[PDB]
Design a protein around this nucleic acid. Sequence first.
DNA 1: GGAATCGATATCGCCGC
RNA 2: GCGGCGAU
DNA 3: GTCGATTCC
Length: 857
Amino acid sequence: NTINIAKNDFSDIELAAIPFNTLADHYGERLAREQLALEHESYEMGEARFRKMFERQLKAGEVADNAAAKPLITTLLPKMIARINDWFEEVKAKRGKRPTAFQFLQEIKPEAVAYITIKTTLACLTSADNTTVQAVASAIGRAIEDEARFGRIRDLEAKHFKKNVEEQLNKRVGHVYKKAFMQVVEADMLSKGLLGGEAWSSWHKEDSIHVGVRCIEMLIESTGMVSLHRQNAGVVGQDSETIELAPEYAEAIATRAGALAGISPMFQPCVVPPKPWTGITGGGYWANGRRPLALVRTHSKKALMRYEDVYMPEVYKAINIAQNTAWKINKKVLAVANVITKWKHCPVEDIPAIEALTAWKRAAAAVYRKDKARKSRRISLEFMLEQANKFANHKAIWFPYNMDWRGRVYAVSMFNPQGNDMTKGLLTLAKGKPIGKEGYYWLKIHGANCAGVDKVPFPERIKFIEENHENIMACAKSPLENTWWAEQDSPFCFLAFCFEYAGVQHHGLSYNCSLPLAFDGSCSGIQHFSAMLRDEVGGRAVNLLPSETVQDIYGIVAKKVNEILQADAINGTDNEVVTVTDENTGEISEKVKLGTKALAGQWLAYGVTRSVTKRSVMTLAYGSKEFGFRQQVLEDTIQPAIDSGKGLMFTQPNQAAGYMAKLIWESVSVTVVAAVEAMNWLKSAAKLLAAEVKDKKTGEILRKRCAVHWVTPDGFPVWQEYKKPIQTRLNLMFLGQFRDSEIDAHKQESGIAPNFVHSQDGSHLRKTVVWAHEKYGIESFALIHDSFGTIPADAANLFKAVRETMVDTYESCDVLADFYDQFADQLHESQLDKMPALPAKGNLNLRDILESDFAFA
DNA sequence: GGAATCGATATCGCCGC
RNA sequence: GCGGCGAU
DNA sequence: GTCGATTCC
Ligand SMILES: Nc1ncnc2c1ncn2[C@@H]1O[C@H](COP(=O)(O)CP(=O)(O)OP(=O)(O)O)[C@@H](O)[C@H]1O
Ligand SMILES: [Mg+2]
Ligand SMILES: [Mg+2]
């Protein structure tokens, strides 16, 4: 019984009587009457959102795992753990055989029990009918039992062995299986590890009821959450004492849930250009919803305020400029999806084209997930395709844009430009230009990108387009009769285009064409680093330097690795049988340690190509180094290998993947040395600044833990402040939640590298939005972090504006150093030496960028 | 110092138990 | 919180 | 299960 918010609350955002004459005037009565009734819906779609989710929270008893009920259990668990702590001193300070519950409740951490009760309590209390203290008490015990039993595993026996457990534990969902897991763990733990009995088999259902009853007692004692009243006293088959939730506390919830359901808005797009950003907040949507948009998406309220008075117009315009872009539904494209999705889970998934256990149960696991997604993935489809259907007859729709704490612009709504193929393919720009002989040279280029040809020179890409002109046309003539679009690396977009490419043919270059051609960078990551350090080797790689042949970072590190293989294939170490005794069993074993010489043999035997290197290198920007590739190598190619038929050669999977790692790791830390250096330098910087330098002779705080802060080239300032709570409260099979804060130096030193590049690309895009807006009449953009698009016509320009906006930023500054000046005077006296120097620069000439056909942006 | 522990892919979003 | 999805 | 790097004895 939740306080329906859908009253005077949402009523707030009045779509007919509010100071909205501002919009009316500016766009009209209808659109301004629309924008507000929409926004209003968003919330109405937000409340509903909350209810149905809250419905199944009660309907499974998980009403404790709901933010609506978590504020009570915060003042409710201190009262209850204290009373059980006095009660343990009440019978300990009194001779005579100790109560039935007290023998057991002396095994499970009291705090735990304390909670265990609260939860399963409210859970059964929200059941259909059965609330009797009989079944109730039975439940509580049932559970507490489990925790003293399997919590001993996590306490002494698997002190470290638990590592191998935790993992498969969390992965296990639902009370049942989690138990299924812990019993089988127990049966093998005493079968090898620590020995003893199982003094829980003596725990009769009686013992269980006993526990579950003395607790509840403690519960109505310490608190009044539940009043223990008699149900029809004076009857033999009706007089049963039962539990009821204190009407007061029930209101707390119904109320907390009420106000909650009103801050989860379903952000739609706008009917009228968004409300420019004046600062910090109030931006994007127009109404004054009980959920304003922040300029920046941040975690802590204070962190957002640090912006309030900051100056940065370069930035405020970017958002605003970019946010003004008008788009429209691709009415043609949509009636294609409107057909094929109603005849297929995935319009483009299947179209008629021309180690025993640990493996059989390996693929079995597959077949499970692969169907999880196929159903989650359609859950998102059904959404888009709906949104899309709402706004198909609208003349033009707009998207508000925030930023993440590090810069990056995002749209606000759910259905947005930064979608997936299908998504992006329903979205084309509202104002067009006529195309022109140069505007169409780019339609076509795009068309080449959308079909997968993009690592071959632009004429080529055009060759392609032209060789298949008939096809394309086919598709655009009749889309449903031809699946050639579909099979294309980006179908729904690539078919976006085919309807344009046939508009050209029917109207010659005078064709008004609003479709977003987009210029994607190579690996923004390495790029920036390689520029901010003039690394010609590296830039070459991401195509910072112009070339005739599209350079492919993966393909080249592939290379550098095949070169090491063959070098070990001839020299290198030989095998080696080393003895490995198990940590749990103490059993002796024989394991031959494949040597470089052979490992390679295999590698070579398998067939190393771009595809064995991609992921590792493409994530190299987020941190992964030598260690993290193993896992990747192994599962991204070694496993699916064996599990595919090939893989024979993979005698020691782990060893083959331990090795390939290092190879990769050596082959990239020489191709993008830049990225390597810049990242590590940065990583140092943050470590230091994270540290809590003291004197271990006073154990005195010399310079507390410093966060990290810098300012992007376009005026944006980023604040890397990762906080870790000092709490804790792990539970086994039920929950295990909440119980001040401090900077978590690890998170801190981790997230610098990525974040920094990530705020940087940030600046860069915000600038090209501006630059190419002011300097060239371009007023219509497609923004995807590292992907800029515009209409066929302004296209020619964009392409250059970027290669421009870029070289400007790297020429004019050295964020690396600038970044120094930022913390420099914050490094305590003592650490002034552990801070390595800014790596030397290179011989790259940024100005080359301006002529790199392939480093689009 | 030396032996004992955490940790290893970044930010945004949606959905779900 | 874990799971999955999707965006770079 | 390698590499190491930071913590407490
Ligand atoms: N290990 C990883 N973890 C998370 N996201 C990853 C990832 N590896 C790749 N991705 C994402 O997956 C996407 C891969 O798309 P692809 O089309 O395979 C890459 P690409 O950069 O166009 O090169 P390609 O043409 O060689 O495929 C990237 O957009 C990236 O953001
Ligand atoms: Mg690609
Ligand atoms: Mg990526």
